[PDB]
Inverse folding.
């Protein structure tokens, strides 16, 4: 069995475990054994959890950030169901009391023994919360639907639990010998080397001698650095660039000067370099795994004595501030450092600014900073996120930052998971506090575990992270054997969708769409495909169950990559078991995921201030190499499709401007139309503010969709942050709907401007949260989130320098400009 598990892990993570063994690497070997132990302890703990605690782990509650209501309740193993009237303010317990009282009268005769499952989903209602605080009930109220729930007894939950078991002395200048290279080029070669602590140089860079593009180049020269060996900070990295000149970059390579056991490195090293686009301090400190073809540098680290970095106990041994403390001059820097005790004492949240003023290239000053740091009070989550930036390379700072993030709720962690995973790319060593933090949290919440897995799995085709990410996924698997098998099922479904999508691509260039679609259906109806594609948890949302694939309703779309549109149904889920996914292969989905996650965050922040813009936060999840899934919002269509203005159709208009309004009218007869116009106005405000703030341009009728409820949302975000200064967009046909069809309607239109202003001003108040998250996202390597000007785009769009009064006036001008332009 131990053999079988290992083969399953290798298959799941997309990398053979034997490959880790073959590295003969102590750091890898250490990581694997420590993390495996940690993860196995988490699993022991989980297996004895109380049944409510188990539910909390497996099906974490889905909550929103007086009225009558009908609810249908059945018991687990029964056809018989009952419809009860309850209040939105009632607790699930009261509901469960009704259900049991009804059961006992039927059967002729305790609520705390039960939880309520949402029919056909892995989602439960339990706890001390009014029904309307549950996302599901809340959702049912707005769409107008009846909640369907199933009474599940504690013994049944426990069966699920059960089925799922498993030094200071060295004053000589730092120096290296550059020995030789092995490489490709057209000119002379040079090696530039710098010593970095994060983004900051610890001293000047020092260049190599120019040697002809001949060879197999052979330097054999001492490069000496303008820094003492005792002043190298613990997280010092040495960064190289190999290039050509008569500039033409060739390659780069980084390494930590100390190893994962804190020992200073000696002597010779062979550096397999990464091909270029000159110094790249934020680039990985691990060699290029393509040793067959990568250019290679050999250096020698001279034996300076073995010295390990000094222990903490040894480290420990060794006005107008406010008016500025809200980029700084050197004298301003000097007062901050001078008054570092006051900073700790009366301005602890200004820790980052103090860290940025310490001289990381002098060990006495670092020991000073560290001394303060070790008694520094915990900071809020917002402050802690800033400290995860690459600007804060020191391990003690890193550790402090994680310590401060431990108070993150699961809902917050989930919201910031994408960025936390991306920060892993900044890590210097395999065994680190972030990895342990993410793994423990993942093992204590299955939803965390699910998305941690997919974020890591979706980048296994990236050589620079394959090893790190592979190792973490292995560790995770040791910690939950059952969930590994659930995840393997999803991977099997994704393997099949790829093969099917490849077929569809080929067929679409040879025959008519009707013919390709029929062939797609025959392929899907093969036993191997019916079995692979049915009965899985959605990678988009593990609480959504994808039961039986409805082949007859599957198709594909006409765009370049021919994305697949896959529908599912489930008898048990009734009608909320009718769900769709899109499989897309050929495009990088990371940018779309980021854009949707930031819009979802806006929706959270708006709702926390009592502003519900009726947004549509659907899933998007990269799963592999230019591969991933998109959640289908049903009962929606594109603005362009609605505006095709076909004859012999409900929405038949005298003027194209009336097409959308007419469409809305046909889906929302009578009284209902007014609320639909309201849903459209609210969502339109939300999306107009979001796409402006994030600089999403190229918005048109083919990438804007509308729900039959009136709710508008966006699809296919190819660009953001003004990378293909985007204006605020007001579209005429939308303004026409907002104005209820009327040419003049300032009452409705100005209500809509109010919504826009209220949404925009709320985001500004959280501007720093967006900034810190985008900062962390720079680790991802998206070409549209690659430098400062990308970030500056967000600063400008949020007008963060300005007072709220100025910001709003500025916004009002952009909005008014948008309205003029509206024809
Ligand atoms: F290529 C398209 F699949 C596509 N790429 C997307 C990237 C991010 C988000 C959504 C994306 N979609 C997408 N997403 C969707 N969704 C996803 C949201 O629910 C409605 C259906 N539909 C489409 N199309 C249907 C109508 O006309 C154009 C294609 N396309």
């Amino acid at each position: 069995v131990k053999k079988l598990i290992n083969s399953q892990i290798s298959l799941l993570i997309g990398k053979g475990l034997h490959e880790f063994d073959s590295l003969r690497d102590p750091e890898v070997n250490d990581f694997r054994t420590k993390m495996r132990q940690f993860c196995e302890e988490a699993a022991a703990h989980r297996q004895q959890l109380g049944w409510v605690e188990w539910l909390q782990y497996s099906f974490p509650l889905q909550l929103e950030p007086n009225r009558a209501l009908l609810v249908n309740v059945k018991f687990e193993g029964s056809e018989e169901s009952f419809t009860f009237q309850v209040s939105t303010k009632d607790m699930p317990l009261a509901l469960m009391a009704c259900a049991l009282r009804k059961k006992a009268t039927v059967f002729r005769q305790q609520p705390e023994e039960y939880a309520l499952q949402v029919n056909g989903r892995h989602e439960y209602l339990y706890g001390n919360y009014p029904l309307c605080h549950f996302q599901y009930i809340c959702s049912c109220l707005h769409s107008g639907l009846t909640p369907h729930l199933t009474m599940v007894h504690s013994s049944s939950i426990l069966a699920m639990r059960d089925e799922q078991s498993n030094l200071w002395s060295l004053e000589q200048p730092f120096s290296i010998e550059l020995i030789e290279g092995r490489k490709v080029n057209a000119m002379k070669l040079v090696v530039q080397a710098g010593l970095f602590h994060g983004n900051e140089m610890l001293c000047k860079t020092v260049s190599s001698s120019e040697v002809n593009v001949c060879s197999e180049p052979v330097w054999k020269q001492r490069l000496e650095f303008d820094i003492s060996v005792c002043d190298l900070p613990r997280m010092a990295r040495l960064c190289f660039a190999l290039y050509a000149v008569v500039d033409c970059p060739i390659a780069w390579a980084n390494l930590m000067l100390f190893d994962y056991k804190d020992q200073l490195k000696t002597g010779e090293r062979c550096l397999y370099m990464w091909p270029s686009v000159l110094l790249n301090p934020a680039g990985t400190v691990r060699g290029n795994p393509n040793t067959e073809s990568a250019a290679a540098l050999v250096i020698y680290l001279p034996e300076v004595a073995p010295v390990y970095f000094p222990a903490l106990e040894k480290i420990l041994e060794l006005q107008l501030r406010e008016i500025l403390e809200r980029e700084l001059y050197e004298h301003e820097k000097d007062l901050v450092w001078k008054m570092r005790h006051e900073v700790q004492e009366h301005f602890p949240e200004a820790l980052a600014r103090l860290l940025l003023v310490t001289k990381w290239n002098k060990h006495e000053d670092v020991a000073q900073m560290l001394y303060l740091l070790c008694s520094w009070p915990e900071l809020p989550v917002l402050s802690a996120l800033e400290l995860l930036d690459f600007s804060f390379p020191d391990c003690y700072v890193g550790s402090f930052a994680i310590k401060s993030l431990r108070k993150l709720t699961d809902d917050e962690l989930f919201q910031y998971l994408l960025q936390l995973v991306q920060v892993l790319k900044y890590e210097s060593y395999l065994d680190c506090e972030l990895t342990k933090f993410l793994l423990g949290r993942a093992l204590a919440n299955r939803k965390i575990g699910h998305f941690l897995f997919w974020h890591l799995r979706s980048e296994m085709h990236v050589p620079s992270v394959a090893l790190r990410f592979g190792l973490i996924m292995e560790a995770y698997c040791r910690g939950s054997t059952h969930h590994m098998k659930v995840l393997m099922k999803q991977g099997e479904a994704l393997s099949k969708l790829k093969a099917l999508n490849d077929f569809v691509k080929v067929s679409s260039q040879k025959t008519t769409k009707p013919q390709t679609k029929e062939m797609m259906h025959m392929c899907m109806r093969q036993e191997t495909y019916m079995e692979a594609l049915s009965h899985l948890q959605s990678p988009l949302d593990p609480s959504t169950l994808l039961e039986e694939v409805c082949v007859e309703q599957c198709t594909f779309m006409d765009s370049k990559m021919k994305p697949l549109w896959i529908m599912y149904s489930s008898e048990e889920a009734g009608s909320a078991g009718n769900v769709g996914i899109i499989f897309k292969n050929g495009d990088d989905l990371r940018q779309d995921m980021l854009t949707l996650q930031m819009i979802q965050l806006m929706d959270v922040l708006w709702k926390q201030e009592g502003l519900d813009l009726r947004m549509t936060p659907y899933g998007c999840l990269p799963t592999g190499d230019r591969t991933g899934l998109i959640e289908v919002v049903l009962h929606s269509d594109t603005i362009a499709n609605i505006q095709l203005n076909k004859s012999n159709m409900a929405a038949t208009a005298a003027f194209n401007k009336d097409a959308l309004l007419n469409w809305l009218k046909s889906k929302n007869p009578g009284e209902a139309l007014d609320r639909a116009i309201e849903e459209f106005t609210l969502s339109c405000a939300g999306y107009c503010v979001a796409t402006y703030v994030l600089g999403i341009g190229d918005r048109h009728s083919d990438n804007i969709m509308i729900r039959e409820s009136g709710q508008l949302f966006h699809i296919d975000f190819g660009h953001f942050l003004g990378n293909f200064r985007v204006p605020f967009i007001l579209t005429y046909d939308f303004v026409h709907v907002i104005q209820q069809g009327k040419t003049n309607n300032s009452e409705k239109f100005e209500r809509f401007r109010g919504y826009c202003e209220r949404a925009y001003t709320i985001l500004r108040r959280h501007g720093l949260l967006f900034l810190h998250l985008f900062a962390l996202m720079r680790a991802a390597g998206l070409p549209e989130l690659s430098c400062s000007k990308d970030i500056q785009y967000l600063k400008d769009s949020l007008a963060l320098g300005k007072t709220e009064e100025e910001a709003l006036k500025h916004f009002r001008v952009k909005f008014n400009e948008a309205l003029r332009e509206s024809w």
The first strand starts at residue 68 and ends at 75. The radius of gyration is 30 Å. The longest helix spans residues 481-508. Residues 557, 559, 563, 582, 584, 592, 618, 620, 630, 632-633, 636, 638, 705, 715-716 surround ZS4 (CB under 6 Å).
